[PDB]
Amino acid sequence: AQYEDGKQYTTLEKPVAGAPQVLEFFSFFCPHCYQFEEVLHISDNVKKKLPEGVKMTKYHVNFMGGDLGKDLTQAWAVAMALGVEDKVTVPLFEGVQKTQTIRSASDIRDVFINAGIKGEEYDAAWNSFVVKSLVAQQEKAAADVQLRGVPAMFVNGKYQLNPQGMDTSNMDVFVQQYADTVKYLSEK
Structure with a gap:
């Protein structure tokens, strides 16, 4: 299919009860986290596509x-x-x-x-x-x-974003796929 377990995302073998709908982890020390936030704007691009009534949570x-x-x-x-x-x-x-x-x-x-x-x-x-x-x-x-490790993002305490199973060529294509994948998972 278009979205596949093991590809754009993975599934937690132990699902988390009462988890935030969209949960991002990061560190201000994390070089890839700097890229994610300040250059790729992953959080912002995800939020722009989230369904109504879906809030985004970010933890350090x-x-x-x-x-x-x-x-x-x-x-x-x-x-x-x-x-x-x-x-x-x-x-x-x-x-x-x-x-x-x-x-x-x-x-x-x-x-x-x-x-x-x-x-x-x-x-x-x-x-x-x-x-x-x-x-x-x-x-x-x-x-x-x-x-x-960070950066990381989890959806409904069940699915983990897997950016390494996405494309890295165009930053922007990557960001779009990441954001589209979160939206797909939110509706799953």
Whole structure:
């Protein structure tokens, strides 16, 4: 067929109960994740084709970057709690990988301050139990899909996107296939 198990996607041998409809994992340390987000715009292209009533969820992972990696997961939790993902995603990627001016938790915070989040607001979120639970949620989700690497995307806790079973020639053809595959899986 056009879409095939083992090709554009694979099927989790152990399906995840109550999973987000579309779940992306990434790290601000991850070079391919930088490409996915800042050059290929995978998240955006997926969301543009999702059925109505399908929300997209994105989680950070700890296993890259040691202490700063975990700081970044906690800062991503702050971004989710405050609803400012679309204000900090680009400067966090660029700060870690382009300028490499993000080397500590304080450097992460600076990104939020520069983007207009009050220090007061950031600090209260950072130290909140709501953010600790969002960190725990992200770690939980990774365990649930038995995550081994990033970037990664899962649909309805059942299917895993398989970009290596897609075409790599045209970035754009690749992005279109990826986005079309997510849409197909969402309706499956």
